[PDB]
Amino acid sequence: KVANVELYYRAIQFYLEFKPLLLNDLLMVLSPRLDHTRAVNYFSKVKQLPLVKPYLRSVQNHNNKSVNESLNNLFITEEDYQALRTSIDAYDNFDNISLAQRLEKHELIEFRRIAAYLFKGNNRWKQSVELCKKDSLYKD
Amino acid sequence: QFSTDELVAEVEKRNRLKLLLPWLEARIHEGCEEPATHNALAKIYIDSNNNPERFLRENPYYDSRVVGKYCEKRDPHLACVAYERGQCDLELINVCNENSLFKSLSRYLVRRKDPELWGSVLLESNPYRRPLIDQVVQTA
């Protein structure tokens, strides 16, 4: 019921410093009239983004840029890909090249497989097909 | 030959306005459209410890100014309605802005849509503009 908006960006800090565990409820309540981009940009400084991941999973519908990039970074660190396939398929408001740089050397067959996949979302063969020559003689 | 709007001033010093109830009751039963009586009825209704808000709204004979200045400190919640129907916008801001719920003000201005009123108010002279805007953001 508050008029201004900066009190949101102060109260997030308030809880985070005091009662960070009861922050997800506020986040779910306050997501509608909130610039989530600033929220993630501020959380990157303090770096508690792994806490608020399931909330951003809900906010993903809005298809914001920094939301997508950050949550994909968190999937990278968590080393999960099944959710990453859904994120990239259902949402495209992000650059494919930066994600490709990380996925093509992620020590893991499947992440590198995705690094080969999303190239064709940019219509760039001759590297994807060539990337998977190195490992996948298994028909891919 | 008789003076009506100053016996009230006389008994005000004597503080026995309840003395004048029956005569003025019959006088209004006749249906005289005199502000001298229709305002005194409101004044005694105020000191009755009752809620004369609807008598204040449905009596199109008295004058808003005397009830407003009289109900300034005793009850601005009624003086604002007096000014509302009496269209005493300047007095409304002269009292309700000073000490009141500014939501009723915003309800009146949005109701009584008047650009000149906004112009008179929205020029950064009045120190009390931030609360009423922080209210009308919700009342609209």
Q: State the smallest CA–CA distance between residue B96 and chain A in angstroms.
A: 20
CA pair distance B131, B99, nearest whole angstrom: 12
The contacts of residue B39 (CB under 8 Å, 6+ apart) are B62, B63, B66, B67
Q: Given an 8 Å threshold on Cβ–Cβ distance, is B138 in contact with A1?
A: yes
Closest-CA residue to B94 (of B119, B112, B120, B63): B120
Residues of chain A with C-beta less than 8 angstroms from the C-beta of B138: 1, 3
Distance between CA B24 and CA B37 in Å, rounded?
A: 7
Q: Do residues B127 and B97 lie in contact, with contact meaning Cβ atoms separated by under 8 Å?
A: no
Residues near A118 by Cβ (< 8 Å), separated by ≥ 6? Answer: A88, A96, A99, A100, A103
Q: Which structure tokens are listed for B96? A: 């309700």
Determine whether B41 is exposed, middle or buried from the number of CB atoms within 10 Å of its CB (0-12, 13-18, 19+): buried
Alpha-carbon span A122 to B133, nearest angstrom: 49
DSSP for A76-114, written as a single string: HHHT--HHHHHHHHH---S-HHHHHHHHTTSSSHHHHHH
According to the entry, how was the structure determined?
Answer: cryo-EM
Task: Answer whether B137 sits within 8 Å of A3, measured CB to CB.
Answer: yes
How close A7 gets to chain B, by Cα (Å)?
13
Quote the CA–CA distance of B40 and B23 in Å, as a whole number.
12
Question: Each residue of B94-109: b (16+ CB within 10 Å) or e?
Answer: ebbbeebebebbbbbb
d(CA A86, CA A68): 12
Place of tokens 């996948």: A136
| Cα distance between residue B24 and residue B26, in whole Å | 5
| A-chain residue closest to B132, CA distance | A3
Q: Best of B102, B133, B137, B139 to disrupt the A interface by mutation (most A CBs within 10 Å)?
A: B137
Stated in angstroms to one decimal place, the resolution of this structure is: 4.7
CA-to-CA distance for A2 and A4, rounded, in angstroms? Answer: 6
How much is the CA Rg of chain B, to the nearest whole Å? 17
- Taking the C-alpha atoms of residue B117 and residue B89, their distance in angstroms, rounded to an integer, is 8
From A3's Cα to the closest Cα of chain B, the distance in A is 5
- What Rg do the C-alpha atoms of chain A give, in angstroms? 18
Q: What is the 3-state secondary structure (H, E, C) of B9-28?
A: HHHHHHCCHHHHHHHHHHHH
B76-86 and B102-111 helices, crossing angle to 10°: 10
CA A83/CA A86 separation, integer angstroms: 5
Q: What whole-number distance in Å separates Cα of residue A75 and Cα of residue B52? A: 66
Q: Write the DSSP assignment of A28-81 as a string of letters.
A: HHHSTTS-HHHHHHHHHHHT-TTTSHHHHHHHGGG--HHHHHHHHHHHHHHT--
Distance from the Cα of residue A40 to its chain's centroid: 10
Question: Measured between alpha carbons, how far is A120 from A105 in angstroms, rounded to an integer?
Answer: 18
Q: Which of A52, A53, A112, A64 is nearest to A91 (CA)?
A: A64
User: Which residues on chain B are in Cβ contact (under 8 Å) with A1?
Assistant: 138
Contacts of B124 (CB under 8 A, 6+ apart): none
User: How far apart (Å, rounded) are the C-alpha atoms in residues B29 and A140?
Assistant: 98
Contact B134 A1 (CB under 8 A): no
What lies within 8 Å, CB to CB, of A66 at 6+ separation is A36, A37, A40, A41
Q: Long-range CB contacts (< 8 A, 24+ apart) of A111-120?
A: A111/A76, A111/A81, A113/A140, A114/A81, A114/A84, A114/A85, A114/A88, A116/A140, A118/A88
Do B122 and B133 meet the contact criterion of CB atoms below 8 Å apart?
no
Taking the CA of residue A130 and the nearest CA in chain B, the distance in Å comes to 59
| Residues of chain B contacting residue A4, judged by C-beta atoms under 8 Å apart | 134
- The DSSP line for B86-103 is HT-HHHHHHHTTTSS-HH
Q: How far apart are the first and last CA of chain A?
A: 54
